């Protein structure tokens, strides 16, 4: 009955725990105890991008590492040329409370979404000369957190109703849905091979998902409150999370257990955004203390600080060629660092 | 500088002027957050205010803009993300009073909303809705059949009204950094904007004077 099934589940949980514990032959700190510290990193502003009238909430780099899109809580997207601080496009939105954006790999489309529970896909190359909306995707029952392109016809969507979805843009209907969380979901990221993707869900738990099948393969635990950010390591078999516990964590998908913890005693504010670097050596994170911190991933120490903003930092991004870093905060300014 | 980046710079300047045309409107805007109930007649109130997931309304009173946000029953969201209404200056709460059996339910929502951290520097404007069925029910159905702490007679309207206001007011922990306001409206449909206007003006003056008093 119910009791026998619960006992079998407990036995399986004990099996999983024993398997996880048996593989802990070493810690991450002991293997890398002979690697030279990075020293000190003193980055500086190269350009300051001005023009927004409210708080920035998301940004995304392009595939050529020269163009970018930014979005704020006044209903506007701006496409900037970062070399000459030119404005290439300004697109008005239909709703003002919008919480995500993305940049299609081919350079033809963009996306946005928020509290209206609908995801909008915009087309850039037109014979008439304007940027006009192409698709509206609807079907969720809760607010929209993140959305990322996969191809020119397939998109991925995560909401706060405990589900995730894969959409075919041409037709306009879901092809597969992912269920299995308890609380609402906040962030997701995609592997370089574009076959799997990971997401965290405000229950101190994270899950890895398979696209071609529709089933959840594995989940990890360890935090104590919400999860606010997640990112992929370049090789596609690792990830890192930040939480409102002011604690950052690094997990691996083949060890099936937690690997590293980043924490300090003078920090009492949570993490809003996390991103990686080209070689995986710099782990960058924005905090609620009005600044951003540059961590050495393989050491779990403080390598640098970026302290140029006058409010909370909520957007962080890194280039595809490794030449720049971009930050956006509640002060209505974007900054480019090199 | 290359006969084609000059045109790009001109394009960017045009876009800059188009953006800067809107700062003078963004800087003079007042936001209110509206909360109510399914039986509280929110739609009738909105219609009578001569206005027009989430609904937005924009209007103006005496040359001042106003924006109102209607949350279509999403109050089930109880996480910090949903507290992105930190720019709001007032929360407007419509509550029913003729259907006694639901009153308790409303309080359970009320105590949940006004005790959050982000709303400690904002004002609350309370409307007790329609407030005329009581005039025809207090002599028919006693208010003691649902509550026990009432002391007055079932028929005098003033005692019941004072009791209701006290019960609503006693739900605030560290009651108020900015005061609570309340009114009685049935079908007035004409004077509500003036009351909202005066209360918002008082809150903004409160903040201005506190800023001026820097010793």
């Amino acid at each position: 009955e119910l009791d026998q099934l619960r006992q079998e589940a407990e036995q399986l949980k004990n099996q999983i725990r024993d398997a996880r514990k048996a593989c802990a032959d070493a810690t991450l700190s002991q293997i890398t105890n002979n690697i030279d510290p990075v020293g000190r990193i003193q980055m500086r502003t190269r350009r300051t991008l001005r023009g927004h009238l409210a708080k920035i909430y998301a940004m995304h780099w392009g595939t050529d590492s020269r163009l970018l899109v930014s979005a704020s809580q006044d209903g506007k997207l701006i496409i900037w040329d970062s070399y000459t601080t030119n404005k290439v496009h300004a697109i008005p939105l239909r709703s003002s409370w919008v919480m995500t954006c993305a940049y299609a790999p081919s350079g033809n489309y963009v996306a946005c979404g928020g509290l209206d529970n609908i995801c909008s896909i915009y087309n850039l190359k037109t014979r008439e000369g304007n940027v006009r909306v192409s698709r509206e995707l609807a079907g969720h029952t809760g607010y929209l957190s993140c959305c990322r392109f996969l191809d020119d016809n397939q998109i991925v969507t995560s909401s706060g109703d405990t589900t995730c979805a894969l959409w075919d843009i041409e037709t306009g209907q879901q092809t597969t849905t992912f269920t299995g969380h308890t609380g609402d979901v906040m962030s997701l990221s995609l592997a370089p091979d574009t076959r799997l993707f990971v997401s965290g869900a405000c229950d101190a738990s994270a899950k890895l998902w398979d696209v071609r099948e529709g089933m959840c393969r594995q989940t990890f635990t360890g935090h104590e409150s919400d999860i606010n950010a997640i990112c992929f390591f370049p090789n596609g078999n690792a990830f890192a999370t930040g939480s409102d516990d002011a604690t950052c964590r690094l997990f691996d998908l083949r060890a099936d257990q937690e690997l590293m913890t980043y924490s300090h005693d003078n920090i009492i504010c949570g993490i809003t955004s996390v991103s990686f670097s080209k070689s995986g050596r710099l782990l960058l994170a924005g905090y609620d203390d009005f600044n951003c911190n540059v961590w050495d991933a393989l050491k779990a120490d403080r390598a640098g600080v970026l302290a140029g903003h006058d409010n909370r930092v909520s957007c962080l991004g890194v280039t595809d060629d490794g030449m720049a870093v971009a930050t956006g905060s509640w002060d209505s300014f974007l900054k480019i660092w090199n | 500088v290359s006969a084609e980046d000059k045109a790009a710079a001109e394009r960017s300047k045009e876009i800059d002027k188009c953006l800067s045309r809107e700062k003078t409107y963004v800087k003079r805007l007042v936001k209110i957050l509206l909360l109510g109930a399914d039986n509280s007649g929110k739609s009738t109130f909105l219609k009578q205010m001569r206005i027009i997931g989430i609904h937005e309304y924009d209007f103006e009173i005496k040359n001042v803009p106003f924006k109102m946000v209607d949350v279509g029953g999403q109050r089930s969201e109880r996480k910090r993300w949903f507290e992105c209404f930190d720019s709001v200056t007032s929360i407007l709460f419509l509550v029913d009073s003729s259907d006694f059996n639901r009153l308790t339910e409303s309080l359970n929502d009320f105590e949940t909303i006004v005790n959050n951290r982000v709303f400690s520097n904002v004002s609350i404007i309370l409307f007790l809705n329609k407030t005329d069925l009581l005039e025809e029910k207090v002599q028919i159905v006693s208010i003691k059949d649902y509550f026990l702490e009432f002391e007055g007679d079932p028929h005098c309207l003033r005692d019941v009204q004072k009791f209701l206001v006290e019960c609503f007011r006693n739900k605030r922990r560290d009651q108020q950094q900015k005061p609570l306001y309340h009114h009685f409206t049935t079908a007035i449909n004409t004077e509500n904007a003036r009351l909202i206007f005066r209360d918002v003006k008082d809150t903004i003056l409160h903040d201005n004077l506190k800023q001026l008093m820097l010793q």
Partner: single-chain antibody, 232 residues
């Protein structure tokens, strides 16, 4: 899109004339306009340039002070006015659209033109030859020369390849010396060394004949070449 011009005719010496262009199908308030001329039996020459926002105007050296260029955004109509015509102003005119931002393709859509009859820092181009007999199935390379380097400091190159089929308006073949415009077969290419450039066509077929032109856009004014005619 679509552009329709009007205002041609036959004039007596002295007097004035006016030409108009009307647009349809696109956002005329975000584009820039050029007026180009053509001799009855010879190459092309730039006449005037106006830009969106009405900020800059450039005129030609041979006709400055007699002509005036103007636009009207809400009605989508462009005007050119000319005075005191001589026998050296017998020609056939065309309008051209171009847009400049990061990644654009200027000189994409050409109109249909009209006819008008009257009773040392510039870079000079020279066309290699006037006629080259070819046969279907072969490949062809057509080259022209310049007098100064066309590579600006920021990685660009400014030479444009257009084609004029018999009895039609010009169509863009290559913009910025190495790219390919929309709506064109994928068998064209372009390459060359500093100041000496060449367009390559493979698998010569029918309706692939005409006269080919190479144009420069580094610094006003714009200057054309003689043109090269192809015989299949």
């Amino acid at each position: 899109v679509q552009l329709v011009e009007s205002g041609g005719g036959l004039v007596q010496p002295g007097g004035s004339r006016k030409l108009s262009c009307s647009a349809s199908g696109f956002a005329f308030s975000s584009f820039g306009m050029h007026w180009v001329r053509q001799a009855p039996e010879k190459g092309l020459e730039w006449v005037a340039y106006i830009s969106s926002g009405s900020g800059t105007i450039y005129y030609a050296d041979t006709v400055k002070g007699r002509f005036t260029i103007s636009r009207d955004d809400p009605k989508n109509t462009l005007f050119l006015q000319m005075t005191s015509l001589r026998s050296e102003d017998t020609a056939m005119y065309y309008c051209v659209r171009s847009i400049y931002y990061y990644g654009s393709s200027p000189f994409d859509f050409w109109g249909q033109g009209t006819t008008l009859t009257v009773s040392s820092a510039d870079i000079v181009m020279t066309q290699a030859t006037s006629s080259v007999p070819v046969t279907p199935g072969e490949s062809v390379s057509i080259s022209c020369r310049s007098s100064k380097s066309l590579l600006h400091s920021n990685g660009n190159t400014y030479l444009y390849w257009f084609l004029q089929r018999p009895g039609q308006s010009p169509q863009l073949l290559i913009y910025r010396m190495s790219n390919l415009a929309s709506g064109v077969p994928d068998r064209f290419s372009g390459s060359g060394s500093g100041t000496a450039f060449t367009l390559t066509i493979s698998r010569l077929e029918a309706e692939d004949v005409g006269v080919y032109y190479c144009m420069q856009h580094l610094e006003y004014p714009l200057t054309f070449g003689a043109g090269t005619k192809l015989e299949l």
